[PDB]
Write an enzyme that holds these catalytic residues in place. Structure first.
Site, PDB file in Angstrom:
ATOM      1  N   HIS A 176      38.920  43.615  50.227  1.00 24.25           N
ATOM      2  CA  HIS A 176      39.284  42.691  49.190  1.00 24.25           C
ATOM      3  C   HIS A 176      40.625  42.175  49.594  1.00 24.25           C
ATOM      4  O   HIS A 176      40.656  40.839  49.270  1.00 24.25           O
ATOM      5  CB  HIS A 176      39.885  43.846  47.755  1.00 24.25           C
ATOM      6  CG  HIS A 176      38.802  44.535  47.449  1.00 24.25           C
ATOM      7  ND1 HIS A 176      37.673  44.448  46.686  1.00 24.25           N
ATOM      8  CD2 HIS A 176      38.600  46.107  47.412  1.00 24.25           C
ATOM      9  CE1 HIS A 176      36.967  45.417  46.717  1.00 24.25           C
ATOM     10  NE2 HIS A 176      37.430  46.582  46.823  1.00 24.25           N
ATOM     11  N   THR A 218      46.336  43.339  39.657  1.00 30.36           N
ATOM     12  CA  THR A 218      45.523  41.848  39.441  1.00 30.36           C
ATOM     13  C   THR A 218      44.272  42.089  39.946  1.00 30.36           C
ATOM     14  O   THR A 218      43.394  41.320  39.976  1.00 30.36           O
ATOM     15  CB  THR A 218      46.059  40.745  40.043  1.00 30.36           C
ATOM     16  OG1 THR A 218      46.052  41.149  41.628  1.00 30.36           O
ATOM     17  CG2 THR A 218      47.534  40.526  39.564  1.00 30.36           C
ATOM     18  N   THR A 219      43.726  43.518  40.486  1.00 33.47           N
ATOM     19  CA  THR A 219      42.580  43.866  40.682  1.00 33.47           C
ATOM     20  C   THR A 219      42.120  45.034  39.923  1.00 33.47           C
ATOM     21  O   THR A 219      42.945  45.784  39.598  1.00 33.47           O
ATOM     22  CB  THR A 219      42.286  44.073  42.049  1.00 33.47           C
ATOM     23  OG1 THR A 219      43.194  45.419  42.490  1.00 33.47           O
ATOM     24  CG2 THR A 219      42.777  43.101  43.417  1.00 33.47           C
ATOM     25  N   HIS A 240      52.103  40.089  47.842  1.00 36.00           N
ATOM     26  CA  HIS A 240      52.365  41.055  47.100  1.00 36.00           C
ATOM     27  C   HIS A 240      53.054  42.277  48.021  1.00 36.00           C
ATOM     28  O   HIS A 240      52.253  43.095  48.516  1.00 36.00           O
ATOM     29  CB  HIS A 240      51.303  41.661  46.142  1.00 36.00           C
ATOM     30  CG  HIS A 240      50.890  40.694  45.169  1.00 36.00           C
ATOM     31  ND1 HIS A 240      49.564  40.527  44.942  1.00 36.00           N
ATOM     32  CD2 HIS A 240      51.514  39.341  44.708  1.00 36.00           C
ATOM     33  CE1 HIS A 240      49.661  39.425  43.975  1.00 36.00           C
ATOM     34  NE2 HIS A 240      50.662  38.545  43.922  1.00 36.00           N
ATOM     35  N   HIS A 245      50.106  43.316  50.745  1.00 33.92           N
ATOM     36  CA  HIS A 245      48.935  42.360  51.178  1.00 33.92           C
ATOM     37  C   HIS A 245      49.004  41.199  50.674  1.00 33.92           C
ATOM     38  O   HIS A 245      49.950  40.591  49.961  1.00 33.92           O
ATOM     39  CB  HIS A 245      47.590  43.171  50.367  1.00 33.92           C
ATOM     40  CG  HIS A 245      47.954  43.116  49.112  1.00 33.92           C
ATOM     41  ND1 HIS A 245      48.475  44.277  48.318  1.00 33.92           N
ATOM     42  CD2 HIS A 245      47.538  42.268  47.834  1.00 33.92           C
ATOM     43  CE1 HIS A 245      48.538  43.892  46.974  1.00 33.92           C
ATOM     44  NE2 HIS A 245      48.020  42.711  46.675  1.00 33.92           N
ATOM     45  N   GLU A 303      47.699  33.899  42.779  1.00 36.89           N
ATOM     46  CA  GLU A 303      47.533  34.434  41.570  1.00 36.89           C
ATOM     47  C   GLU A 303      48.304  33.878  40.473  1.00 36.89           C
ATOM     48  O   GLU A 303      47.538  33.269  39.551  1.00 36.89           O
ATOM     49  CB  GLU A 303      47.520  36.044  41.691  1.00 36.89           C
ATOM     50  CG  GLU A 303      46.470  36.383  42.936  1.00 36.89           C
ATOM     51  CD  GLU A 303      46.094  38.009  42.778  1.00 36.89           C
ATOM     52  OE1 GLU A 303      47.026  38.831  42.494  1.00 36.89           O
ATOM     53  OE2 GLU A 303      44.901  37.926  42.409  1.00 36.89           O
ATOM     54  N   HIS A 339      46.845  37.377  48.664  1.00 42.59           N
ATOM     55  CA  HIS A 339      45.810  36.805  48.164  1.00 42.59           C
ATOM     56  C   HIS A 339      45.733  35.290  48.727  1.00 42.59           C
ATOM     57  O   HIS A 339      46.616  34.705  48.688  1.00 42.59           O
ATOM     58  CB  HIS A 339      45.620  36.891  46.491  1.00 42.59           C
ATOM     59  CG  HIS A 339      45.810  38.067  46.005  1.00 42.59           C
ATOM     60  ND1 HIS A 339      44.982  38.969  45.735  1.00 42.59           N
ATOM     61  CD2 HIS A 339      46.984  38.996  45.961  1.00 42.59           C
ATOM     62  CE1 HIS A 339      45.349  40.055  45.061  1.00 42.59           C
ATOM     63  NE2 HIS A 339      46.354  40.105  45.432  1.00 42.59           N
TER      64      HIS A 339
HETATM   65  O1  LIG Z   1      49.161  42.836  42.240  1.00 44.61           O
HETATM   66  C1  LIG Z   1      48.132  43.472  42.760  1.00 44.61           C
HETATM   67  N1  LIG Z   1      47.265  43.263  44.006  1.00 44.61           N
HETATM   68  C2  LIG Z   1      46.555  43.915  44.015  1.00 44.61           C
HETATM   69  O2  LIG Z   1      45.676  43.884  44.821  1.00 44.61           O
HETATM   70  C3  LIG Z   1      46.241  44.947  43.015  1.00 44.61           C
HETATM   71  C4  LIG Z   1      46.514  46.278  43.340  1.00 44.61           C
HETATM   72  C5  LIG Z   1      45.714  47.321  43.259  1.00 44.61           C
HETATM   73  C6  LIG Z   1      45.676  48.703  43.838  1.00 44.61           C
HETATM   74  C7  LIG Z   1      47.034  49.017  44.202  1.00 44.61           C
HETATM   75  C8  LIG Z   1      48.113  48.071  44.221  1.00 44.61           C
HETATM   76  C9  LIG Z   1      47.979  46.799  43.713  1.00 44.61           C
HETATM   77  O3  LIG Z   1      47.408  44.709  42.022  1.00 44.61           O
HETATM   78 ZN   LIG Z   2      48.013  41.751  45.021  1.00 45.67          ZN
END
Ligand SMILES: O=C1NC(=O)[C@@H](c2ccccc2)O1
Ligand SMILES: [Zn+2]
Length: 256
Positions: free
Chosen positions: A60, A194-195, A115, A90, A102, A92
């Protein structure tokens, strides 16, 4: 779940009905409607003792993981009550420089969004924290394309070793302070992951000042794969959820 036509954001609600909930993220930040909240306390980003361990392609995004077994790297202050421990960061990003973030700012999409995910230590571990309305704090930072971000290059250079889903690599001694802009001016609002599982457990803190990264840096993000090794190549691009309805929320600004 994923980001394609048949499994992307418009499908997520079938397995995760909270997708249509009352405090979903991301959102568009309307900068004229956001109101200064003179009461927000100073924000405290304390990453000097951050201990990175590993970088993982999870299909992802890629996550840079930290040792969160002690109060090392923590986020405090601002809208937050108590102490939130860094667990991973991570990004996006998009297939083109004109999309990828996002959150949006007056409907503007940035090329990417970082993030930094933190959990409230009052809940003891991350899995318990995500079950609470104030369980997580995510620090979100926009990326624009321009000058290179020197602090990002060590991340960029390891991506060749985690091209496909399920691959990980040692990633010790990485300093996330090198990913932060000069200003800590921010917007904040209550939202969600957000996922999937889209849990409504996040205090969002989105910095107003983007960082700049080079076109060459983001092009290397776009060489990653959503697929696993030996599978048909699907470039990891456009792994962002679009803005969701604001509903009964106000976005607060830390600044005038
Ligand atoms: O803001 C987010 N980015 C993501 O990938 C999602 C998220 C999912 C799982 C754990 C931590 C964060 O929530
Ligand atoms: Zn994220």
């Amino acid at each position: 779940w994923g980001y394609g036509k048949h499994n992307g954001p418009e499908h997520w609600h079938k397995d995760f009905p909270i997708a249509k909930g009352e405090r979903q993220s991301p959102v568009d930040i309307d900068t004229h409607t956001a109101k200064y909240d003179p009461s927000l306390k100073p924000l405290s980003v304390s990453y000097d003792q951050a201990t990175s361990l590993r970088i993982l392609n999870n299909g992802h995004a890629f996550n840079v993981e930290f040792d969160d077994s002690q109060d090392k790297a923590v986020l405090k202050g601002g809208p937050l009550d108590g102490t939130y421990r860094l667990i991973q960061f991570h990004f996006h990003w998009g297939s083109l420089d004109g999309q990828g973030s996002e959150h949006t700012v007056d409907k503007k999409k940035y090329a990417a969004e970082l993030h930094l995910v933190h959990w409230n230590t009052k809940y003891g571990d991350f899995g318990k924290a995500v079950q609470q309305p104030d369980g997580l704090a995510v620090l979100g930072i926009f990326l624009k394309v321009g000058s290179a971000k020197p602090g990002l290059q060590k991340v960029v250079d390891v991506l060749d070793s985690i091209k496909t889903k399920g691959k990980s690599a040692d990633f010790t001694n990485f300093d996330p302070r090198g990913l932060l802009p000069e200003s800590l001016d921010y917007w904040t609002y209550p939202g969600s992951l957000t996922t999937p599982p889209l849990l409504e457990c996040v205090t969002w803190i989105v910095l107003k000042e983007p960082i700049s990264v080079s076109s060459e840096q983001v092009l290397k993000f776009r060489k990653l794969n959503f697929n696993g090794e030996g599978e048909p190549e699907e470039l990891m691009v456009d792994n962002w959820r679009p803005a969701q309805p604001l509903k009964n929320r106000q976005i607060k600004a830390s600044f005038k």
